[PDB]
Symmetry: C3
Subunit: 255 residues, 3 copies
């Protein structure tokens, strides 16, 4: 069962297609605009698609020709340019874009970004909020915002240092130049590199099947702890409280 | 001179066995339960052993057949299951386990974890609190708690991202699958990989000898600064204050 | 046009030597004391040189025979020893040294550290505050302060974990032993290793030319965001505000 939006496609595959029960799905969100570009429709539709994921155990995010060329400068310029030099108006504009990056990062389930070819700018900021990142050999990653006189402000400068370190983030962000798949894996931006797009998509599906087999609330608590940004003792105490609420005798016995 | 507990063995080797002076030791704590498992005795005895380290300059933590299989599900179930769904009671239970992980992390001297074979779950959380980690070629590391419906709550989700990055921690914690020694070294979880268990233990002893030769309070201040979790300026100011109190003319001249 | 100080040399190269306009420069600061050592003159002169950089688009920091042997123990002892055991007096002494490390870290433009040969102690702490680090094959990096009974307190223990991770910083800081160029690159301390000193200096110049071609305020905002140490949402909101103030139609069109 698929839902076509203007800028994206969302498909959900029932994990059991037999049985008389309502269970979970694996969701796949495809960036479907030209070169996976992000225009004004994207900022409106992506959060709508996220609201459809109440039943989903895992979300895969992927592209078509490439993953994403990032922000479409031309089509977003209509909203951005009139707000330049107006901090409150400018914030309001970027708030719509944060609905995507912060919305994805806040999803309670595992999110797998499966990247082939170009992953540029807002594309890279988006995957920075995913839980697991996989790519193909041909994948190339960059944050070229500086070349346009832009400071990356969709969460890349905050999230990327947790993944690859501050120095390596500074390399990407200050030079604006791309890194290849082998480098991304060395740096910890991705945890697997596959031969090609088809191998990538197959592996993402398999990884999703693996995660969907695991207890949903343990995955959620783990994600919460890693993303909480709380001091050690507070983050620790919150994980303990999560287990108090969500551990079951049954999950112990089954595992 | 050795102390036998039920779950662990603690041995301390005087650094000078000649001389009429009371100096320092190298302490070795061996996880001595079956497969280095951690049951109710472990949580009681491990902090007791730590209280014996007033004279020790370095602590080595190691296993026997393997490093540690982690929590013994069966023997801890007696305490855990009755506390499920009761946040204050559950906290009290896990507090006893934190006495080990937080206790180890708080030790004023260098702690070397020397890992061979399996290092699983609470085993991995424990070494995350050590200062230096060494392993053999055959070592395998995992955080499989998710498979039991558990969110790792002994400090692994807080400590591991400082060592290997958030993305790599998410890989371990969400998939629950193991990584090998070569991967651990690439990721920064360990800083040396040795051919085998005997080579590992010998190297740990040698590294301990090296550290024990260094000024104790400089090692302590360094550990304090790295672990303080304070904002930059506060952490910096505290290191300066530590030097004001602990630097000596003699240590400058000797070095 | 060069400025000779006692401990350093500062040269600034106009980016356009044609034209009737006052533009930007590439600045090169050379550690010019014996083995790039840092004595009392260094702490006074280095901040003076930084005050000369109002027109500079990029700063390169480099050495001569080596990058830096770090603190000259003998010549700083006159100020340090009388302040031992006196927290307020000791702070005052180290404040003069922080004027260098914190001053460099606060510079609004990109700072490139170009390291050949030894980079030791305060030398390593200094480059930890740079934006990009390049080295030659022969470069060796260490934090041997522990051997002198010193806890590194010029920002290395705070900055290095952001670059290479806490475990790897603990290796350097606790053992006091050096790492080579290949290891530094693997660890993320540097992002390029060049064959030799001449190749290093040439590449640093080229990288500076590349960065100087980019919009100055986007580079500044990027540096601010990466270094702010603020919680996620605050750091994010501050980047958005920076763009509101500094993005231009012209920079979009040009890029």
């Amino acid at each position: 069962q698929s839902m076509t939006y203007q800028s994206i496609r969302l498909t959900q595959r029932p994990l059991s297609q037999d049985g008389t029960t309502q269970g979970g799905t694996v969701a796949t969100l495809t960036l479907a605009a030209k070169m996976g570009s992000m225009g004004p429709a994207f900022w409106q539709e992506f959060p709508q698609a996220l609201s459809e994921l109440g039943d989903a155990r895992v979300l895969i995010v992927r592209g078509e020709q490439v993953f994403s060329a990032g922000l479409d400068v031309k089509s977003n310029g209509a909203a951005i340019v009139p707000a330049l030099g107006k901090p409150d108006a400018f914030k309001a504009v970027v708030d719509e874009m944060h609905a995507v990056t912060e919305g994805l990062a806040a999803l309670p389930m595992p999110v797998i970004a499966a990247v082939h070819g170009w992953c540029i700018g807002a594309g890279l900021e988006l995957i920075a909020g995913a839980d697991l990142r996989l790519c193909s050999q041909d994948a190339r990653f960059s944050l070229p915002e500086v070349k346009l006189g832009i400071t990356a402000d969709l969460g890349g400068l905050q999230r990327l240092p947790h993944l690859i370190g501050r120095g390596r983030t500074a390399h990407l962000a200050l030079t604006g130049e791309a890194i290849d798949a082998a480098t991304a894996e060395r740096w910890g931006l991705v945890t697997e590199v596959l031969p090609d797009q088809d191998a990538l998509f197959a592996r993402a599906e398999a990884l999703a099947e693996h995660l969907a087999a695991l207890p949903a609330k343990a995955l959620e608590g783990t994600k919460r702890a890693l993303s909480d940004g709380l001091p050690h003792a507070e983050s620790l105490a919150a994980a303990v409280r999560w287990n108090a609420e969500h551990m079951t005798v049954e999950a112990l016995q089954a595992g």
